[PDB]
Nucleic acid binder design. Sequence first.
RNA 1: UAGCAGCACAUAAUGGUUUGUGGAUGUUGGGUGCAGGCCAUACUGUGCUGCCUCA
Length: 705
Amino acid sequence: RPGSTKRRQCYPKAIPECLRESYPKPDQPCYLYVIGMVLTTPLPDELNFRRRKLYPPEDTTRCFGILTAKPIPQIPHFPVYTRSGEVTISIELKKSGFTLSQQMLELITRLHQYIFSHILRLEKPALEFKPTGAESAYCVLPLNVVNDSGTLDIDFKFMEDIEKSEARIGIPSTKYSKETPFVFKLEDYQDAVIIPRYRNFDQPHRFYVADVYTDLTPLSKFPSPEYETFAEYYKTKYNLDLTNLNQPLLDVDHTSSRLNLLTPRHLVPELCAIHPIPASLWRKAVCLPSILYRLHCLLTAEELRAQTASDAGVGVRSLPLGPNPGLILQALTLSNASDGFNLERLEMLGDSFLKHAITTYLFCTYPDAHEGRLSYMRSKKVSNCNLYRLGKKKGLPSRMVVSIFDPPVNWLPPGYVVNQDLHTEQCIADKSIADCVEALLGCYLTSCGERAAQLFLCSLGLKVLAEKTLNHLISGFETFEKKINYRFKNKAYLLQAFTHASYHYNTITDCYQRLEFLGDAILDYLITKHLYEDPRQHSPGVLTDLRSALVNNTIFASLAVKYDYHKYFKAVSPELFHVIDDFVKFQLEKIEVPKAMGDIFESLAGAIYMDSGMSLEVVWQVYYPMMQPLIEKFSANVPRSPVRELLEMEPETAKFSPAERTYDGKVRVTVEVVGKGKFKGVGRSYRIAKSAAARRALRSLKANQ
RNA sequence: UAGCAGCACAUAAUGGUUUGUGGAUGUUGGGUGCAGGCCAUACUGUGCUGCCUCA
């Protein structure tokens, strides 16, 4: 069925408007952004297993810049988890409206290809570099501080030096001889990436110079137990005789193969070619996939924020407000993506508000429709099927973050195309599209409030925007008004809330059921909002349990009794009065729970809402003090099913019998606890019977301890 | 800077199981829809390893 977990559809991945077809043209205006990088949380030495120097990206003059034909909007700064620790990333506009020659652009584009294909090794047989044909079409280039002025500019000299370098295309063929002996220059290695010239020619291993040992030489002990010295090693393995046996040695670290950095984890110089790119900049380059991917994701969320400000009139289209793009990114992220956050908290809050909004709308739009009809209409509008259709219509599937980020397996680099797919497409369940709509609603609600959330629903396509008899029938309710600490402006709502369908003496208002319908959704929402805003920051699972335990007719009935609602209840059913008196007796001492007592509790919430001029706050002011003791009790001690508690205490020993229908229509259930006895429970339903059996077993077990 | 095979965990897919829930021919409750918790087949990622490339 549409909106079901069992139905899956494939969708193309969305690329932000500011990155789509964004390739700089010769002699045309372009934009240059600096990738600002700051080490905000250094990695502890215990996690840094080699205890290597942490390299704050900010300690070095060279960085990367993004060159694009279209402007990039302001995005929140975001963390990246490097081997140095948490690095906060900023994307900062450095130059706008400037032009580049064909030769300058060719140098930039060639170096851009060189980064992704040669440095990062992301170009695969399935991928082709087509910068003019690629959907995501921007260039990345080196920036450097000009003359120590602290001002960053395009390092053209360095790009040209990379082009003149033979080391660009492969391993340099410069073999040293006794006539042309190798000369070590320290300045050339302090911030160098090196390539060993005698091995692994198809995939040359690259290393960062971590340090230069001036005390160690080719005659010193080799790190592999296979050889006595560095000179013996090269002579034995590659037949290479060194010209300079007194040259210093390089301490080196492998260039990182891990390109996903979005979450926390917790040699002889003469025989090496110097890669023309410095090690500092190469460390920055390794972050480009996570940075660009995150940038792309945040730009998609900002695009959705801006689109919603245009379509719903919620927030401002361009920031100097609407929700933070990071919260939108949360609402667009499935738990499968493993990105440190998920849509589940926002989804649950949205659902509760959605119910409230539709319930209110239906109640006001259909003044003559009975509860069962409003409940039926409600059930259709809030369905996972309808929500899926709305999310699909809004283009959410192409914007959702569904799978774990893996650059060489599921990411397309800028300027590349796929040779005709984990790079361009994703498979999504219809239910997940529905869940995302509720999470977006929760985002707008938490960030911009209820009116904004309603305007957001309207933007998705959900339309969400006698007197003598009265005085006689309300006689004595003044004590009730004082007990609840609320005075009704229109006592007809109070009368309606306490009028059962059997109470035909009331010919001036309806029965309580319509207000029950309205109140149910109000209480669910208010309770859910409160639980979501709770300082304990309950998990999605715990929020579900607490919502289930607090939003319950039994609890509403228990409160109705404690607050004397039963004394004001108007009914003409002696049996109902006896059931209420028996339940009231049971509640006063500490057995069927009278449904009507929970219903009138909800109906009075509906009454107060209508009498207060649709003020949820007034309703909450009245109900929160009544519910606060229970909210505190269950949020301190998250509740349990007696069947589950018995199964937790006795998992292999407690076995329940099938449902036995007794001669009176009532169900009987027996629980056998191996070595501890058999306990029988009876009730009008299998759980009432099974729970009664489980409670009898639990009582016996606890009494024998 | 490489590949593979075990173990932990997360995770979606296709089956089953179990709690909640719905209007339904509802002769007095087994027809189907959606959620949770489990069992199985099979996917990916990180990590604890193990073998195994270069050093």
